[PDB]
Design a binder for this molecule. Structure first.
Ligand SMILES: CO[C@@H](/C=C/O[C@@]1(C)Oc2c(C)c(O)c3c(c2C1=O)C(=O)C(/C=N/N1CCN(C)CC1)=C(O)C3=O)[C@@H](C)[C@@H](OC(C)=O)[C@H](C)[C@H](O)[C@H](C)[C@@H](O)[C@@H](C)/C=C/C=C(\C)C(N)=O
Ligand SMILES: CO[C@@H](/C=C/O[C@@]1(C)Oc2c(C)c(O)c3c(c2C1=O)C(=O)C(/C=N/N1CCN(C)CC1)=C(O)C3=O)[C@@H](C)[C@@H](OC(C)=O)[C@H](C)[C@H](O)[C@H](C)[C@@H](O)[C@@H](C)/C=C/C=C(\C)C(N)=O
Ligand SMILES: Cc1cc2nc3c(=O)[nH]c(=O)nc-3n(C[C@H](O)[C@H](O)[C@H](O)COP(=O)(O)OP(=O)(O)OC[C@H]3O[C@@H](n4cnc5c(N)ncnc54)[C@H](O)[C@@H]3O)c2cc1C
Ligand SMILES: Cc1cc2nc3c(=O)[nH]c(=O)nc-3n(C[C@H](O)[C@H](O)[C@H](O)COP(=O)(O)OP(=O)(O)OC[C@H]3O[C@@H](n4cnc5c(N)ncnc54)[C@H](O)[C@@H]3O)c2cc1C
Lengths: 473, 473
C-alpha cells in the first residue's frame, strides 16, 4: 500500500518526497507533465534553503551546479551591500536555475526510492476515515493513507477540497519573455539602465545563447489572463522603453499578477497543501520556491511520524499552525515591495526614504533576514528567544552540527554531559559534545532544525520530549 | 527710509523682523488682518526651532508659555519612544499653541523697534534698481530697499512676482473642526481609538473649554475648496467613525489638502519669499512653522548684511541655495508620510514594515532628526562633515555657547588660543575658550549657528572669512 500520494512534482513535492523517503514512507509523486519543464522561474536559493540542503547532505551537489553571490537589492530592488553580520553560516545566495534545482531534487527523491509518475494528472479525490483515493484524468485510481497537494498555484487539490483562498486580487500585471533582439547587448543595457531610474519592473538578463529574458510591465489587466502575444510584448516595450529592440522568435511568453492569496486551512482531514498550492504572491525577493521547500521540510518528518504511528495527536496540525503564518508574512512583505516599485509620487517618496534607511546595518540585515527566512520563529510557547527558531550551523569538536542531521531525526545537542533521551532513542539522537560552539547548556532540535527546548535539567527535558517525539518506548 | 518691508505678520515675518531689528534695520511689517488670528494650527516647536530661540535668548519666555514633551509618533504617527541619543542639547518638543508663538514673536519684534502695521494688505508691488514699492489695498504706497513676501501659502507677493510654484496637486483632503459634542469624552476617545486602528487621519483633541478639535478625512475633493459646512462635517464623521457624536456649535471649520509646492526662485531681484509663501505641504510631522522660522533665521542676517553694505555679492543668493533644497526634502518626506497614512493594502503593508524598522534606534533617530530639522546640512563645499551643519549647544568654561549668540553676529569658537578675526571684529566675535566642550581646534559659526569653517590654521581661517562676512575693515 502507498503511504503518501504527492500531487505535483515541482520542487515542493520533490523535496517532500525526499523527506518522506528518509523514513521508509512509501511515496508516489503524481506529476501531470510528461517531461520536465525546461523554463526556469526561480534563479536560485536563499540562505535558509541552502542550510536545509546542507542539513540533508545535498549542499555539495547544489554548489557544484550553482554560483555563490553576496550582492544587495533583494528587498524591492533597494541597492545595498550584503549584510556582513547575517546570523547564518551560509551567508550568500546560490544562483541556480529552478530547472536545475528540480533536476537535483528529482534525482535525490528517486535514489531514495520515491516513485515519480509523469503524465499522471490528479482530477478527483475521495477521502474517508482510513485513506484518500486519487482519481487520475485517465480514470485510474490510486489509494493511500494521505495525499498532499503540491500541485502549484492553480492547485486542483485545493479547488476540489473547497478550501477558501482569500487575499488581495491581482491589480498589477507584468510580462515575461525569452526572445532574441536586433540590438547589441550594450544598447539594450543602456536603455534598461535609463528606464530603471524610475520603472524598476523593467529588466533584461541574457540567456547566454543569444536569447534574452525580458521583464516588462503590462498595460492594464487582461481579461483572458492568457499568455501575451509577441504583439502585446512589443506594445509594452514601446510604452515602457520607447522601443521594442526588434524582439522576435519568442521561445517563452508569460504574464503574472501580484495577487496574494493564502489557503485558509493547510489540512483537510487526510489531505494537506504545500507550496504554491497553499499560497501565491509576487516574485519580489525571490521567496516562493524557498517558501515551498521549507513547507515540505516542515511537513515531511511530521507526516512520516503519522505514518510511523508515533505522532502525537497535535503534531500534524502543527504544520498549519507553523507554516500558515510564515506564508502570511511573506505575502505581506511582497505587497510592501510592490508598493516600493510603484511609479506613483507617494510610493516614490517612501522608496527614497527606504533607500536612506537601508544604509543602516540593522535595517539591511532585518530586510535580508526576512527575505531569506533565516529569522523565522515558530511560536512554540516558550520564553527563550531561541526556542522556535532554526539553529544555525555550528562547529562541533569534530565537524559541524549539520553533518549529524542527514537522517532527518531529532537531535539533542548536549554540552552538560549529563542529559539523556533514553526512551526516544529511535527518534532522537544524543549529541553529547561539550566542545560545541553553542552558548546554551543543551538544545533539543526537531528534525527540521528548529529548537524545541533549551535548558540543563533532565526532568525539564523529559517533559518537552513528548510534544514533538511522542510517547517513550 | 524703510530698509525692509515684510508682507505678512505670521511667525515667519515676525521672526524675520526680529532678526533684522538686531542689526538696526528699519523694518515695517504689513499684516493684512486687523487683529491677531485666534485659531492655532501648530501645536508646538521642534528641536531646531527651540535651539534657535535659545540662540536669541527667547527660550525662557517660550518655556514659560509651553510644556516640554518627549514622546514618539512624529513620523506618520509611527508609535515609538523619543530617541535617547538625539544630537541636541534641546531634545524635546515644546507644546505651545501657534497663537501663543505668534504672540511672543510679535512682542519681541515690537520691543526691538520693528513697526507692525495691521489692517495693511499688500495688493501690488513695483521694484526697480534701487528699491521696491508696496501698494496697499487702500491705494497707499510704501517704499523700501527690499520686500520679503512672508504672506502665507496663498501669497500675494509670489503671485505678483509670477514665480512658478510647481509640485504635486492636492489629491487628499482633510477636515478640521472646533466643535462641541453630545457624548462624554470617554465615549469619543473609545470610538477614536477604534477608528485609529486603521484610519489614522482621524483624531480628537479637547480644547479644555468644552470644545473639541476634530480631524476627519474629507469625502473626495471639493470644487470650491471653501470651508466645509457643519453638514459636511457630519457626513464625514458618519463615513469615518459611524457617528457624528452630535457635533454642534462650530467655532472653526476648515479644509486642507496634501498638495506639495515649492517656489522656483526664493529671490526675484529685491523681492524674496519665506515661509508658506515659498512652500506648502501637509502638516504631517508638524514641520511648516518650524520651516518658516528657520527660513527667516537663514535670511535675517544676510538681508541685514545687504542693508549694512558689507554683504558679499553672492550672500543674498545663498538664502535660496540653502533653504530651497531644505524645503524640497520637507515636501518629499510629507508625501512619504501621507502614503504611510493611506488605507490602501499596499501602503498598509509598507506601514507595518516601517513599524518594524522604527524599533531600531538608528531608524527612530534618523526619522526624528529629519522631522525636527537638527540634521540639516547646507552644502558649503567643504569636506568636513560638521561644515554646513548647525552647531549644537555646548558647555563653555563658564556658561554655554548659545548664550554668546544673542546679538546675531558671527562667532569664532577658538580653542587654540592663537586664532584671530582682526579685520572682521565688528561682524565676528572671538570666543577664545580652550575649555569649550568641542572636539575641533576651532569652528567659525555664521550668525545662524551653521558651521562655516573648522581648522587650526590662521591663514586657512582668513581665506574662509570673506565668503560669509565680507571684506576686512
Ligand atoms: C526587472 O527585474 C526586477 C523585477 C521587478 O519586478 C518583479 C515583481 O518581478 C520579478 C521577477 C519576474 C523575478 O523573476 C524576480 C523578482 C521580481 C520582482 O520584484 C525579484 O524581486 C527577485 C529577488 N529580488 C528575483 O530573484 C526574481 O527572480 C528585479 C528582478 C530586480 O530589481 C527589482 C525592482 O527588484 C532585481 C531584484 C535587482 O536587479 C537586484 C539588484 C538583483 O539583480 C540582485 C538582488 C541579485 C539577485 C540574484 C540573482 C539575479 C541571481 N541569483 O543570479
Ligand atoms: C488625527 O491626528 C493625526 C492627523 C493625521 O493627518 C495629518 C495629515 O493631519 C494633521 C493635522 C491636522 C495636524 O494638526 C498635525 C499632524 C497631521 C497629520 O499627519 C501631524 O502629523 C503632527 C506631527 N506629527 C502635528 O504636530 C499636527 O499638528 C496626527 C496628528 C496624529 O497621528 C498621525 C496619523 O500622525 C499624531 C501625529 C499622533 O497622535 C502622535 C502620537 C502625536 O500625538 C505625538 C507625536 C505628539 C505630538 C505632540 C503634540 C500633539 C503636542 N505638541 O502636544
Ligand atoms: C517569474 C517568476 C519568478 C520567480 N522567481 C523566483 C525566485 O527567484 N526565487 C524563488 O524562490 N521563487 C521564485 N518564484 C516562485 C517559484 O517559481 C514557485 O514558488 C515554485 O515553483 C513553487 O514550487 P511548487 O513545487 O510549489 O510548485 P510548482 O512549481 O508550480 O509545481 C507544481 C507541479 O504540479 C504539477 N501539477 C499541476 N496540477 C497537477 C495535477 N492536477 N496533478 C498532478 N500534478 C499537477 C505541475 O505540472 C507542476 O510540475 C518565481 C515565480 C515566477 C512566476
Ligand atoms: C491644520 C494645520 C496644522 C499645522 N500644524 C503644525 C505643527 O504642528 N507644527 C508646525 O510647525 N506647523 C504646523 N502647521 C503649519 C504652520 O501653521 C504654517 O507653516 C505657519 O503658519 C507658516 O507661517 P508663515 O508666517 O509663513 O505664514 P502664515 O502663518 O500663513 O501667515 C502669513 C500672514 O500673511 C498675512 N497676509 C496674507 N496675505 C497678505 C497680504 N497680501 N498682505 C499682508 N499680509 C498678508 C496673513 O494674514 C498672515 O497673518 C500646520 C498647518 C495646518 C493647516
Amino acid at each position: 500500500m502507498i503511504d503518501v500520494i504527492i500531487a505535483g512534482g515541482g520542487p515542493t513535492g520533490l523535496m517532500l518526497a525526499g523527506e518522506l523517503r528518509l523514513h521508509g514512507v512509501r511515496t508516489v509523486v503524481l506529476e501531470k507533465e510528461p517531461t520536465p519543464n525546461q523554463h526556469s522561474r526561480s534563479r536560485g536559493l536563499h540562505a535558509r534553503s541552502i542550510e536545509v540542503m546542507d542539513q540533508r547532505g545535498l549542499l555539495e551537489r547544489f554548489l557544484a551546479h550553482g554560483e555563490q553571490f553576496r550582492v544587495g537589492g533583494f528587498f524591492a530592488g533597494l541597492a545595498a551591500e550584503w549584510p556582513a553580520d547575517l546570523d547564518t553560516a551560509h551567508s550568500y545566495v546560490l544562483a541556480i536555475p529552478q530547472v536545475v534545482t528540480e533536476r537535483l531534487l528529482t534525482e535525490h527523491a528517486t535514489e531514495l526510492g520515491a516513485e515519480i509518475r509523469r503524465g499522471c494528472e490528479v482530477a478527483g479525490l475521495d477521502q474517508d476515515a482510513d485513506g484518500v483515493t486519487a482519481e487520475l484524468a485517465d480514470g485510474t485510481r490510486l489509494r493511500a493513507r494521505y495525499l498532499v497537494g503540491c500541485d502549484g498555484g492553480r492547485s486542483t487539490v485545493r479547488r476540489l477540497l473547497g478550501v477558501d483562498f482569500p487575499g488581495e486580487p491581482t491589480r498589477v500585471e507584468t510580462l515575461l519573455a525569452d526572445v532574441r533582439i536586433d540590438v547589441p547587448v550594450e544598447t539594450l543595457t543602456a536603455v534598461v539602465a535609463e528606464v530603471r531610474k524610475t520603472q524598476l519592473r523593467f529588466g533584461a538578463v541574457p540567456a547566454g545563447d543569444g536569447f534574452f529574458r525580458l521583464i516588462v510591465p503590462a498595460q492594464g489587466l487582461s481579461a483572458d489572463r492568457a499568455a501575451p502575444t509577441l504583439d502585446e510584448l512589443k506594445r509594452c516595450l514601446h510604452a515602457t522603453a520607447g522601443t521594442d529592440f526588434g524582439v522576435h522568435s519568442p521561445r517563452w511568453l508569460s504574464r503574472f499578477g501580484d495577487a496574494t492569496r493564502l489557503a485558509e486551512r493547510y489540512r483537510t482531514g487526510r489531505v494537506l497543501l504545500a507550496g504554491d498550492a497553499a499560497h501565491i504572491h509576487p516574485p519580489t525577493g525571490g521567496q516562493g520556491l524557498n517558501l515551498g521547500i521549507q513547507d515540505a521540510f516542515n511537513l515531511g518528518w511530521k507526516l512520516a511520524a503519522a505514518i510511523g504511528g508515533w505522532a502525537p495527536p497535535d503534531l500534524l496540525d502543527s504544520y498549519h499552525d507553523e507554516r500558515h503564518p510564515v506564508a502570511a508574512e511573506v505575502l505581506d512583505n511582497t505587497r510592501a515591495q510592490m508598493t516600493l516599485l510603484s511609479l506613483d509620487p507617494g510610493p516614490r517618496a517612501v522608496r527614497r526614504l527606504m533607500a536612506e534607511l537601508v544604509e543602516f546595518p540593522d535595517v539591511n540585515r532585518h530586510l535580508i533576514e526576512k527575505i531569506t527566512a533565516i529569522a523565522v520563529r515558530y511560536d512554540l510557547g516558550d520564553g527563550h528567544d531561541l526556542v522556535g527558531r532554526r539553529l544555525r550551523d555550528i562547529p562541533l569538536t569534530e565537524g559541524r552540527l549539520y553533518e549529524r542531521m542527514r537522517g532527518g531525526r531529532g537531535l539533542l545537542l548536549d554540552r552538560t554531559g549529563r542529559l539523556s533521551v533514553s526512551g526516544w532513542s529511535d527518534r532522537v539522537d544524543h549529541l553529547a559534545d561539550p566542545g560545541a560552539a553553542l552558548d546554551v547548556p543543551a538544545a533539543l532540535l526537531r528534525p527540521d532544525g528548529h529548537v524545541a527546548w533549551v535548558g540543563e535539567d533532565q526532568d525539564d527535558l523529559l517533559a518537552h520530549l513528548p510534544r514533538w517525539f511522542g510517547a517513550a518506548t
